[PDB]
């Protein structure tokens, strides 16, 4: 099992750490957060308002964060080039702070001793991957890669199935997204994105998302054929993608249900899900799928113009894919 | 000023009454609700969690509901044919209970003495109207009409402008809607629509809506060219329409903005609004427009496939249109 | 052997009692009656839960029965409780969860169908009330119709018992900051009897009257007339908190209050009364089966005789598990 | 003769004090200092408000100034308060609303720029604290730096004053069910000092410590050491409620408590202390400029000496209007 280091014990960093222990696919050996001390890290990992108390043991012992008897080395560095990743035995580093997404900034970890870096966010220049869509294009020469956004990971598996079977001429997407840590409880300041500063509890907030554009950077045939926007709404977790698209070949709705059902049962098992149940957002809380096609929620205007709905736990689905990507990277070593 | 009777003092009935006094276009002279007594009606009209305390005076006096010194006759009938609408001087009756939407059911009010009935909801058989779109097709022979739904009243004015200028080849709509009185606080029973029974506070609930299909009945050229679905989200009021459509003529996004701005300043003034501000849902609370085009929120894939965003106060916007429709009917009398 | 139980009403309490029965395995649900929810809808409502998640097990409709974990349950669709053939389905006890038959005369209708005992999963004006860990030992086989009090009394009474037994409660006033309930409205709607309860649940803090503190007196007779309170309904889907401000007879340092509560949670009230010193919030008690959990860090003392004691409760799980525990206790006395 | 005021910080308090100044017209805002919010963003933040709606007038950027209702306001972008040219803009008083300069030494920096008096819109460790209607008459012209206490202190103190003056408060314990604040997090985030305050604001009832009941003893010296309490943050955007459980020296029937509160709201505490017998909920006090409104129907008495008194407050508009009223009072004493 590959030994992993996690930079940042924020919402992504903690959920990637929890996915690592829950799945057991990788071994967390080090965590770096210059602001959260060891005692606070135990509290933040143990208790979760959204996903509940950690099913396992969490304790501070000899200056280390012990999760299920596994001692994890804690670092408090502000500069990523100063983290002694190699000393703690961290082969891979999950860059989850969101402030080092370019290969230049993400490359500071390689100076500490890390061999590979996985950016748990979209990157402007690093190669992007989505498990089940283009992870086979990963090779050992790639020292710094990105796992795209949770929305890019929800849309791309559905886009792959729909394009492979009927061909997406063009598509426009909307994601009705749950509130995130970047939003404000009451009307506050967000100098760059004014709407994002408005009260998260009281508002439907339109937001810009490069996730539908990013899908074309992972399914190169769809490059320039997809774009979209988001609406942040007052729910703590679980989001939904709404893809309105035009198809090349005609597609009856029940043929597109059969097509997604096959992919969910075969190659995209655990990545792409399929349901015909009368589901609502809370039904996908702690669901580890990247995306789950909602058959009953979608609607077709004609054989070439459809609206396809797909749910995703923006927190769990994505953190599990970061772990799956590293497990795949380790197998190619 | 025409004298109006309101059947049902529910959320629509109270807000239509409020719009009548706020705008002064109509005179409410009678209200019928077999369940809410006069004292409770004073409380429900005066205090509103969403729109605040009524700006004016409300009292119970001599068995009459007195709003701004205007005495309103109160009836407690379960059978709509037994309401003495004519005795109270009610020329038009707003049928807001939602349980008498067919012309046969809504026609019962004419037995009590009413001359015309306006169903404040979609009807299976009554002629439908949307102010600013097809209200000129109303004529004095029509004794029972429908004002369509609040979502139709938001989509149809935008669809009218977009189709008149560029031609809508086909369109698919999503409405991210605020919670309604038909939803449940916690997981409860809704035998017909299972998803609508699930906890309103905790969930994004997909729902079916014939509002996009209904635009084809007020704009006969778009018949069969539009359909959609809804997502109910945890906000008390203000909803948004997201129209993804293909245009016949090419349309740069600034040309779409230009023609919408012109319609909002000219013929659809007060019905269709236009904004370039960094708005969120709460900015449209108590906004009486039927729909307000959000220029900054929309996105174009090319010059033939666009996503157009438009806000609507699902409560005040529609209620004011019920009053405007009656103010129109009176002018044709 | 395990008591066979019938559940009247498949509403929020009825489903969670049925859930607690299978999760704990203390009793066997053999029949359910709801005249409005059909068998197919019952499968959906039991399987999926927004608050507590999908049911850990299997649930399916098969041959007109609701099979949960391979156990077939007989479904009835009766509006009149006297017309339910409880005895035919083998139901020895009936949980009256509809909330509309809380008097002994109304709840007694279930005995006409063949039931032997009726447990009202709500407060009753006349039936004997019980709170597990406080006065369940006063239950005897002569009692054919009993009440399990409310969720709020089942939270307050175990804390009141410990505090009164050790220091004596001279007088107390409590406030419960409660989660939204099925009786509330999504937007400003009509609630003819309780006008405030009709106002939008999402937008408001709604003051409400509750006889739960008064009901503690009917379970700890020494505190009769010594306790009263009110509630504030707030916009959270589940988990509530009790705030008891009281005057004590004997002096009590806050660490002595903590010490005696910790002892009771580890000994006789294990699983009923909990104790924590952690930096907890409401979501930390979601699906917690305790009747009440004393929050040591949240409470505050003015002086040795005047304190504010905070205690959390999953108003949904804590209570339904106590309905199951009460019937398991009744079965042991048979 | 409107006193010309400067506002340091265009955060929620700063904007709401500016809004109260124009809505009430009691003082003239002439300058605003915020080193992070530029003029164009200030127009947006003042014009649109999720809680209180769009401003009742006009807001625009013109010639590098913020013009509200035709009144041009000078904008400063200084990080050091001592470097703000308050005197050049004509600002006689400065409202210190950033929350980071609450000591008299820190708040005194504004006097170096040319200000004559500084009003801290928050509690201060050392500055004299005032609550309008309870101790504002103790303000005198020697006081160049004062504090307006907190929003909860301004709610509790006027009710405590009436109750103590008529019946005498032997001892009291207060709980405030408070709306969410800017210091909370949307989802589980870090708050190193107060761990519970970092947990998701939308999902939780969060117990919190508050020195607001203790602080009432400063403005009402007769209640020093006689009051303490805690808070519960709940998922509502605005409007909070105080719950005072207290023991009275003199017996008081609940109708006598109502009678004396109604008299104070109609007489000396008109506009500060309100009184209602209506079936009110929190949203009914949104944009209500009262410091506290006694809810007659929500409170409950156990006996003539032990009561729970409920009082609502718009934690935003109540307090902001008191900052403006306090400065209008200071100007009258000049």
| Chain B CA closest to residue D282 | B49
Strands (E), B138-225: 144-146, 168-177, 205-208
Q: In whole angstroms, give the CA distance from residue C4 to residue C89.
A: 9
Q: In whole angstroms, give the CA distance from residue C102 to residue A327.
A: 58
Q: Is D181 annotated as a binding residue?
A: yes
- The residue segments making up the domain with residue D168 are 153-315
Among residues A150, A205, A241, A260, which one is catalytic? A150
Output the CA torsion sign for D246, D249, D253, D258.
negative
* Whether A101 and A177 share a structural domain: no
Q: Which positions in chain C touch D205 (Cβ < 8 Å)?
A: 177, 234, 236, 239-241, 281-282
3-state SS, residue B175: strand
Tokens representing residue B174 in the block: 């999503």
Helix residue spans in A167-252 (DSSP H): 211-215
Q: In whole angstroms, give the CA distance from residue D331 to residue D334.
A: 5
In chain C, how many domains are there? 2
Query: Could you confirm whether B154 is annotated as catalytic?
Result: no
Q: Directed axis angle between helix B38-46 and helix B11-23, to 10°?
A: 70
Q: Is D24 annotated as a binding residue?
A: no
* Whether C9 and C76 share a structural domain: yes
* Whether C298 and C226 share a structural domain: yes
Q: In whole angstroms, give the CA distance from residue C46 to residue C26.
A: 19
Q: In whole angstroms, give the CA distance from residue C256 to residue D56.
A: 56
> How far A99 CA sits from the closest chain B CA (Å)?
25
CB B325 within 8 A of CB B258: no
DSSP letter for each residue of B42-80:
HHHHH--TTT-S-SS-EEEETTEEEETTEEEEEE--SSG
How many CB atoms within 10 Å of residue D1? 6
- C14, burial (CB in 10 Å: exposed 0-12, middle 13-18, buried 19+): buried
In a domain, C14, yes or no: yes
Q: In whole angstroms, give the CA distance from residue C202 to residue C180.
A: 9
Integer CA distances (angstroms), B69 to A193, B58, B66, in order: 48, 8, 5
In a domain, A137, yes or no: no
Candidates D108, D99, D115; CA nearest to D4 is D115
DSSP letter for each residue of C6-44:
EEE--SHHHHHHHHHHHHH-SSEEEEEE-SSS-HHHHHH
* Whether B51 and B163 share a structural domain: no
Q: Is B209 annotated as a binding residue?
A: yes
CB C31 within 8 A of CB C17: no
Tokens representing residue B250 in the block: 């090419």
Name the structure determination technique.
X-ray
- B190, burial (CB in 10 Å: exposed 0-12, middle 13-18, buried 19+): middle
* Whether A98 and A167 share a structural domain: no
Q: Which chains touch C (3 or more CB pairs under 8 A)?
A: A, B, D
- C141, burial (CB in 10 Å: exposed 0-12, middle 13-18, buried 19+): exposed
Place of tokens 């004596």: C168
Q: Which positions in chain B touch C189 (Cβ < 8 Å)?
A: 10-11, 181
3-state SS, residue B143: coil
Interface contact B204-A228, CB threshold 8 A: no
Integer CA distances (angstroms), A230 to A191, A233, B231, B242, B291, in order: 19, 10, 13, 11, 20
In a domain, C137, yes or no: no
Q: In whole angstroms, give the CA distance from residue D77 to residue C98.
A: 63
* Whether A187 and A81 share a structural domain: no
Tokens representing residue D97 in the block: 């609303």
Label residues D311-330 b or e (16+ Cβ within 10 Å = b).
bbbbbbbbbbbbbbbbbbeb
Interface contact D236-C236, CB threshold 8 A: no
* Whether D89 and D157 share a structural domain: no
| Secondary structure of C143-178 as H, E, C letters | CCEEECCCHHHHHHHHHHHHHHHHHCEEEEEEEEEE
* Whether D163 and D300 share a structural domain: yes
Q: In whole angstroms, give the CA distance from residue B186 to residue B197.
A: 8
Element holding C67 (H helix, E strand): strand C65-68
A40 contacts chain C (CB < 8 A): no
A237 contacts chain D (CB < 8 A): yes
Q: In whole angstroms, give the CA distance from residue C119 to residue C108.
A: 10
C187 contacts chain D (CB < 8 A): no
Q: Directed axis angle between helix D317-333 and helix D12-24, to 10°?
A: 60
Between vectors from CA C23 to CA C20 and to CA C24, what angle results, nearest 5°?
Answer: 80
In a domain, C13, yes or no: yes
Strands (E), chain D: 4-8, 28-33, 59-62, 65-68, 71-76, 93-96, 117-120, 145-147, 169-178, 206-209, 227-233, 240-248, 273-276, 292-295, 300-303, 306-313
Tokens representing residue A121 in the block: 């966010």
* Whether C220 and C119 share a structural domain: no
Candidate from C175, C227, C295 with C-beta closest to D175: C175
C-alpha dihedral, D55 to D61 to D67 to D69, nearest 10°? -40
In a domain, A180, yes or no: yes
Strands ordered across the beta sheet of C306-313: C206-209, C227-233, C169-178, C240-248, C306-313, C292-303, C273-276
In a domain, B291, yes or no: yes
Q: Which residues contact D221 (CB under 8 A, 6 or more apart)?
A: none
Q: Which of B110, B126, B142 is the last residue of a domain?
A: B126
Q: Which positions in chain A touch C44 (Cβ < 8 Å)?
A: 277-278
Strands ordered across the beta sheet of D117-120: D59-62, D65-68, D71-76, D28-33, D4-8, D93-96, D117-120, D145-147
CB A139 within 8 A of CB A115: no
In a domain, C332, yes or no: no
List chain C gaps (C–N > 2.5 A) by preceding residue: none
* Whether C101 and C232 share a structural domain: no
CATH of residue C16's domain is: 3.40.50.720
CB D78 within 8 A of CB D88: no
Interfacial D residues in 290-309 facing C (CB < 8 Å)? 295, 297-303, 306-308
CB C119 within 8 A of CB C323: yes
How many CB atoms within 10 Å of residue D270? 12
A52 contacts chain D (CB < 8 A): no
Which residues sit opposite A94 in a β-bridge? A6, A118
Q: In whole angstroms, give the CA distance from residue A253 to residue A295.
A: 9
* Whether A167 and A300 share a structural domain: yes
Candidates A283, B68, C179; CA nearest to D177 is C179
Q: In whole angstroms, give the CA distance from residue A9 to residue A97.
A: 8
In a domain, C140, yes or no: no
DSSP letter for each residue of C85-144:
-TTTTT-SEEEE-SSS--SHHHHTHHHHTT-SEEEESS--SSSPB--TTTTGGG--TT-S
Label residues B76-110 b or e (16+ Cβ within 10 Å = b).
eeeebeebebbebebbbbbbbbbebbebebbbbbb
Place of tokens 């979601």: C286
Helix, strand, coil % (nearest 5) of chain D? 30, 25, 45
Indicate the pairing of strand D306-313 with strand D300-303: antiparallel
Q: Directed axis angle between helix C254-266 and helix C151-167, to 10°?
A: 120
Q: In whole angstroms, give the CA distance from residue C67 to residue C61.
A: 6
CB B5 within 8 A of CB B302: no
CATH of residue A188's domain is: 3.30.360.10
* Whether A78 and A224 share a structural domain: no
């Amino acid at each position: 099992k590959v030994k992993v280091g996690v930079n940042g014990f924020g919402r992504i960093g903690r959920l990637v750490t929890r996915a690592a222990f829950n799945s057991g696919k990788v071994d967390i050996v080090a965590i770096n957060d210059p602001f959260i001390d060891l005692n606070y890290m135990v509290y933040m990992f143990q208790y979760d308002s959204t996903h509940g108390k950690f099913h396992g043991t969490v304790k501070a012992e000899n200056g280390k964060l012990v999760i299920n008897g596994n001692p994890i080395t804690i670092f408090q560095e502000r500069d990523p080039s100063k983290i002694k990743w190699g000393d703690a035995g961290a082969e891979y580093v999950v860059e989850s702070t969101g402030v080092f997404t370019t290969m230049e900034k993400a490359g500071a970890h390689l100076q500490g001793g890390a061999k590979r870096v996985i950016i748990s966010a979209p990157s402007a220049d690093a190669p992007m991957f989505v498990m089940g869509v283009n992870h086979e294009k990963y090779d050992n020469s790639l020292k710094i890669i990105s796992n795209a956004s949770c929305t890019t990971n929800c849309l791309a598996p559905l886009a792959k199935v729909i394009h492979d079977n009927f061909g997406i001429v063009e598509g426009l997407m909307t994601t009705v997204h749950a509130i995130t840590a970047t939003q404000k409880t009451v009307d506050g300041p967000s100098g760059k994105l004014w709407r994002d500063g408005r009260g998260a509890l009281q508002n439907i907030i339109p937001a810009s998302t490069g996730a539908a554009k990013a899908v074309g950077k992972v399914i190169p045939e769809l490059n320039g054929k997809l774009t979209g926007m988001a609406f942040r709404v007052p729910t703590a977790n679980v989001s939904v993608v709404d893809l309105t698209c035009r198809l090349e070949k005609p597609a009856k709705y029940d043929d597109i249900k059969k097509v997604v059902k096959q992919a969910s049962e075969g190659p995209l098992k655990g990545i792409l899900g399929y349901t015909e149940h009368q589901v609502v957002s809370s039904d996908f809380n702690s669901d580890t799928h990247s995306s789950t096609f909602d058959a009953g929620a979608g609607i077709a205007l004609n054989d070439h113009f459809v609206k396809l709905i797909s749910w995703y736990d923006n927190e769990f689905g994505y953190s599990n894919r970061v772990v799956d990507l590293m497990a795949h990277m380790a197998s190619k070593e």
